[PDB]
Amino acid sequence: MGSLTKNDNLHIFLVCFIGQGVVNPMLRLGKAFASKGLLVTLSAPEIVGREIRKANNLNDDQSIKVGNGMIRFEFFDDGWESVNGSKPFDVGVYINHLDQAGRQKLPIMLKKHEESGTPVSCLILNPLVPWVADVADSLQIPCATLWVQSCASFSAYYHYHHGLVPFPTESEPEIDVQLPGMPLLKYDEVPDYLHPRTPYPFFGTNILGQFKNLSKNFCILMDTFYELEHETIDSITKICPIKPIGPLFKIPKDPSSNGITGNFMKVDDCKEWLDTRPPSTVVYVSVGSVVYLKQEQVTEMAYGILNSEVSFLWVLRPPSPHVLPEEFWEKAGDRGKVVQWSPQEQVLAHPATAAFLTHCGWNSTQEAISSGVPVITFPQFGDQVTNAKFLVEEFKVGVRLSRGELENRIITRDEVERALREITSGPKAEEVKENALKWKKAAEETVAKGGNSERNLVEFIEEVARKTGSKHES
């Protein structure tokens, strides 16, 4: 191999987009790198940097030490407030703006790190900023992308963008889709951003932008694990350099980096009330922050919860409706608790928790899998309808409530009551609970030393080290 003529650290430079859905997985990846001694720069537009500085207490240089590793923050000015003015935020307009502004700002940052003696070893982007890979390719800087949805969802978008398999069109809106290494998907089980009936076609186009220059990333980091989607991963690896490294939230947390958070919203305290509950009795209900439920759907949920008589912890976050029935609060004093934002990981790990009524976002899908908590699937849009199909039919840890908002119907209180009673007692409840405990074990092993996800991460670091030549001068 040759005698050592240099002993440089590596410098990982992550580039975020907007919102907690990108910052948190990106920040979790950066904390893993910093615990292994690498210098990590979390970079983001200034509109994100305002929320990061407000949520945390960053010092004058905005950096924390983790051994010889480090997590530092470098926010760049996207010029958005000056250009956008009084207009309401439009993510379709913004993503194009960040493309132009990012291509101007990133080379300046990278050139400065080169002059300052801290050259960037690897850029890591996400699907909504694929221009990072263009700048990386032009500078001969290795780059990788962090896919934060399931591998099933990746395979759907890949085959759609490349036209490798017939998808539902306006002429045939209801044909099934058979993807390699996947179960057969119904027309409404494909990530419905890609379906012609979607009200959000722009969300699909934005995700599809990752695939136009995907081959510029030498590695596709995935927030999933091999045991969970082994058949889909086997089929995709033959085409793309994907490497499952998830669940990102289950990687061992280093205490010297646990002070940093990517969550921007206040967290209500659920631990105190959960501790008073008998084990495996509370049904945790949450649709996240992006889902906005109509009043009529909330009412049927309240009556279903009330008629089911189950104990519950309901995350009912309003915008800036929603009134619950009066009879609900008469009985809620003994049975349930209603909050606006819960500590979901802590809640799913509590011994009082029995099930998770969820909208089936991929983070929640993985957190339920990793916690051994069975689910009631209540998908709304996007890849949720896909995650819901896997939770119930493939992972076999779930009970179905709805098929997504494109079904265009209110889920009645009788449907809510039946699903709640089914996940809490009877033969189906025992089956999905047992399967969920086998997924909890598999998730805890893949991130442990020697696990599939842990090995792929160290392999990525070593591959970066080889490309950088961190121990051989030139």
Q: Write the interaction track for ligand UDP spanning residues 5-24; mark x where CB under 6 A is met and - where it is not.
A: ----------------x---
The interface region with ligand UDP, picked from 38-46, 47-55, 301-309, 336-344 by CB under 6 A, is 336-344
Binder of ligand UDP out of 312, 362, 390, 395 (CB under 6 A):
362
Q: Is the peptide bond before 45 cis (omega within 30 degrees of 0)?
A: no
**Residue 21 or 142 with smaller CB distance to ligand UDP:** 21
Count of residues that bind ligand UDP according to CB under 6 A: 16
Binder of ligand UDP out of 106, 315, 373, 432 (CB under 6 A):
315
Binder of ligand UDP out of 206, 217, 344, 370 (CB under 6 A):
344
Closest CA to 268 of 286, 244, 250: 286
Q: How far is the CB of 179 from ligand UDP (least distance, A)?
A: 22
Q: Which does 86 bind (CB under 5 to 8 A by kind): a second copy, ligand UDP, none?
A: a second copy
Q: Which does 108 bind (CB under 5 to 8 A by kind): a second copy, ligand UDP, none?
A: none
Footprint of a second copy on this chain (CB under 8 A)? 86-93, 199-200, 202, 268-269, 292, 294-296, 299, 316-324, 326, 329, 337-340
Residues 192-231 within binding reach of ligand UDP (CB under 6 A): none
The interface region with ligand UDP, picked from 176-184, 294-302, 322-330, 343-351 by CB under 6 A, is 343-351
Q: How far is the CB of 250 from ligand UDP (least distance, A)?
A: 12
Residues 281-310 within binding reach of ligand UDP (CB under 6 A): 286, 288-290
Contact call for residues 413 and 307 (beta carbons, < 8 A): yes
**Residue 143 or 360 with smaller CB distance to ligand UDP:** 360
**Residue 73 or 193 with smaller CB distance to a second copy:** 193
**Residue 182 or 360 with smaller CB distance to ligand UDP:** 360
Binder of ligand UDP out of 114, 345, 407, 459 (CB under 6 A):
345
Contact call for residues 5 and 460 (beta carbons, < 8 A): no
CA distances for 249 relative to 30, 364, 457, angstroms: 12, 11, 14
Binder of ligand UDP out of 227, 367, 405, 422 (CB under 6 A):
367
Q: How far is the CB of 183 from ligand UDP (least distance, A)?
A: 21
Closest CA to 236 of 173, 155, 127, 332: 155
Measured at CB, which residue is nearest to ligand UDP?
A: 361
Answer positive or negative: Cα dihedral of 109, 111, 115, 119. positive
Residue 405 as a binder of ligand UDP (CB under 6 A): the answer is no
Q: Which does 281 bind (CB under 5 to 8 A by kind): a second copy, ligand UDP, none?
A: none
Amino acid symbol at 12: I
Alpha helices per DSSP H over 162-289: 201-208, 230-237, 271-274
Looking at the DSSP bridge assignments, the partners of residue 216 are none
Q: How far is the CB of 324 from a second copy (least distance, A)?
A: 6
Q: Which does 345 bind (CB under 5 to 8 A by kind): a second copy, ligand UDP, none?
A: ligand UDP
Closest CA to 148 of 331, 387, 452: 387
End-to-end CA distance of the chain: 15
Binder of ligand UDP out of 8, 56, 341, 438 (CB under 6 A):
341
Q: Which does 241 bind (CB under 5 to 8 A by kind): a second copy, ligand UDP, none?
A: none
Q: Which does 139 bind (CB under 5 to 8 A by kind): a second copy, ligand UDP, none?
A: none
Closest CA to 43 of 10, 15, 11, 63: 15
Residue 6: how many CB atoms within 10 A of its CB? Answer: 11
353: helix, strand or coil: strand
Going across the sheet that includes 69-76, the strands are 63-66, 69-76, 39-45, 11-15, 122-125, 143-147, 219-222, 242-244
Burial (CB count within 10 angstroms: exposed 0-12, middle 13-18, buried 19+), residue 208: middle
Q: Which residues contact 365 (CB under 8 A, 6 or more apart)?
A: 150, 358, 375, 387, 390, 391
H/E run at residue 300: helix 295-308
Q: Which does 367 bind (CB under 5 to 8 A by kind): ligand UDP, a second copy, none?
A: ligand UDP
Tokens of 44: 């983001």
The interface region with ligand UDP, picked from 201-209, 210-218, 228-236, 340-348 by CB under 6 A, is 340-348
**Residue 169 or 295 with smaller CB distance to a second copy:** 295
Residues after which a C–N gap over 2.5 Å breaks the chain: 320
Alpha-carbon gap, residue 452 to 446, rounded angstroms: 5
Which residues contribute to the site for ligand UDP (CB under 6 A)?
21, 286, 288-290, 315, 341-345, 361-364, 367
